[PDB]
Amino acid sequence: PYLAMFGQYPDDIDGTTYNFDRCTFSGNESKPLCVELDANNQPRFPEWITIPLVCIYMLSTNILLVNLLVAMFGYTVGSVQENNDQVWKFQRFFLVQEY
Amino acid sequence: PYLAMFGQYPDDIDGTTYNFDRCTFSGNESKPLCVELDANNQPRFPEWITIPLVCIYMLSTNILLVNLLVAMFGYTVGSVQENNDQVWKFQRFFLVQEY
Numbered sequence: 077p078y079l080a081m082f083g084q085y086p087d088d089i090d091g092t093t094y095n096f097d098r099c100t101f102s103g104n105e106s107k108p109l110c111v112e113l114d115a116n117n118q119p120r121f122p123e124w125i126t127i128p129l130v131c132i133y134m135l136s137t138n139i140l141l142v143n144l145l146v147a148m149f150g151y152t153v154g155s156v157q158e159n160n161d162q163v164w165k166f167q168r169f170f171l172v173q174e175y
Numbered sequence: 176p177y178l179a180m181f182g183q184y185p186d187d188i189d190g191t192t193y194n195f196d197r198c199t200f201s202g203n204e205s206k207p208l209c210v211e212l213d214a215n216n217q218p219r220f221p222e223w224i225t226i227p228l229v230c231i232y233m234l235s236t237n238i239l240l241v242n243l244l245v246a247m248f249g250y251t252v253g254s255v256q257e258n259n260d261q262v263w264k265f266q267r268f269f270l271v272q273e274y
């Protein structure tokens with residue numbers, strides 16, 4: 077999910093896209109466990125629950141949240157522009173007196 | 176089209192890029208139907224109609240719309256900053272009295 081915000085889309089969520097080469101049935105390996113199967117040896121997850129969930133998650137993370145953060149940063153830089161100059165001037169005394 | 180905003184570019188829009196392995200001629204399969212062919216067994220779509228359409232769609236979605244949303248969020252956070260404090264203070268009474 078952390079990578080999902082950087083444009084990476086989960087792969088093991090669609091039966092068609094899912095590939096069994098990556099996964100392993102047992103734990104004696106270094107790749108993720110395979111999806112739970114059925115008596116017919118096919119993926120069992122409904123596939124109409126995961127896709128909308130991922131769509132909503134990606135919409136919330138990639139787009140809305142970053143835009144909100146941009147807005148907050150804009151307001152913050154606008155609000156405290158003048159006080160930052162005074163703070164920098166105050167610290168300039170220490171910076172100059174250091175040498 | 177929903178995924179198209181997350182940076183994914185459609186593949187079955189260019190004759191060179193289009194691959195027949197994914198598609199299926201008949202419906203007895205779990206992958207999308209193949210593009211309509213011609214008497215010579217080649218893709219039939221003009222290829223000069225789809226590409227500009229996709230370019231315009233991607234330009235509208237990925238870039239313009241999200242930037243507009245960012246602008247709206249910035250204006251909204253700027254406008255209602257003071258009233259939000261009063262609303263939070265009002266709800267603080269209920270939050271404190273809950274316990």
Ligand SMILES: CC(C)CCC[C@@H](C)[C@H]1CC[C@H]2[C@@H]3CC=C4C[C@@H](OC(=O)CCC(=O)O)CC[C@]4(C)[C@H]3CC[C@]12C
Nearest residue numbers: 091120121122123124125127128131132135176177178
């Ligand atoms: C505000 C909008 C733009 C955001 C959400 C729109 C779509 C991205 C979502 C909403 C409901 C979703 C659909 C809900 C159910 C299904 C059927 C699903 O196929 C199955 O259910 C078969 C299940 C099986 O084979 O076991 C494939 C995706 C689809 C069309 C989902 C794909 C994406 C849809 C259209």
Ligand SMILES: CC(C)CCC[C@@H](C)[C@H]1CC[C@H]2[C@@H]3CC=C4C[C@@H](OC(=O)CCC(=O)O)CC[C@]4(C)[C@H]3CC[C@]12C
Nearest residue numbers: 122123124125126127128129130131132133134135136
């Ligand atoms: C069947 C599947 C594919 C779709 C449904 C699964 C989730 C997408 C549902 C389950 C619980 C739902 C959530 C229940 C509570 C909330 C909080 C709500 O926002 C708030 O917390 C503020 C409410 C307010 O302003 O008063 C927005 C929707 C959300 C995430 C709901 C949206 C959709 C959720 C996550």
Ligand SMILES: CC(C)CCC[C@@H](C)[C@H]1CC[C@H]2[C@@H]3CC=C4C[C@@H](OC(=O)CCC(=O)O)CC[C@]4(C)[C@H]3CC[C@]12C
Nearest residue numbers: 190218219220221222223224225226227228230231234
């Ligand atoms: C404001 C600008 C920056 C946005 C649009 C610019 C280009 C991305 C678009 C505008 C018109 C498009 C062109 C319209 C027609 C064609 C020819 C097309 O090839 C064919 O028509 C052959 C058809 C066939 O083989 O059957 C390949 C793409 C190209 C150059 C299109 C590719 C992209 C172009 C240059």
Ligand SMILES: CC(C)CCC[C@@H](C)[C@H]1CC[C@H]2[C@@H]3CC=C4C[C@@H](OC(=O)CCC(=O)O)CC[C@]4(C)[C@H]3CC[C@]12C
Nearest residue numbers: 221222223224225226227228229230231232233234235
């Ligand atoms: C031959 C192919 C490859 C290019 C042409 C196909 C589409 C790109 C054309 C067909 C109809 C056109 C649309 C007709 C109407 C509108 C609405 C217009 O914006 C408005 O609705 C507001 C108008 C106003 O401000 O008065 C912007 C262009 C658009 C999307 C036009 C732009 C280009 C469209 C989508």
Ligand SMILES: FC(F)(F)c1ccccc1-c1cc(C(F)(F)F)c2[nH]c(C3=NOC4(CCCCC4)C3)nc2c1
Nearest residue numbers: 129130132133134135136137139140141142143144145
């Ligand atoms: F910037 C932002 F915050 F996105 C946002 C900006 C502008 C307007 C609304 C929101 C918002 C707020 C909340 C809430 F206030 F409720 F937290 C949201 N919650 C969710 C989801 N909940 O669960 C999901 C993740 C876990 C899987 C199920 C889906 C996404 N999307 C929200 C969007």
Ligand SMILES: FC(F)(F)c1ccccc1-c1cc(C(F)(F)F)c2[nH]c(C3=NOC4(CCCCC4)C3)nc2c1
Nearest residue numbers: 228229231232233234235236238239240241242243244
């Ligand atoms: F933020 C935004 F809105 F993008 C936008 C922001 C700033 C200036 C203009 C726009 C805008 C407005 C409209 C309209 F107001 F007309 F709706 C647009 N329409 C379209 C397209 N129409 O159809 C397409 C999708 C379907 C396939 C054909 C191409 C894209 N791009 C627009 C850009």
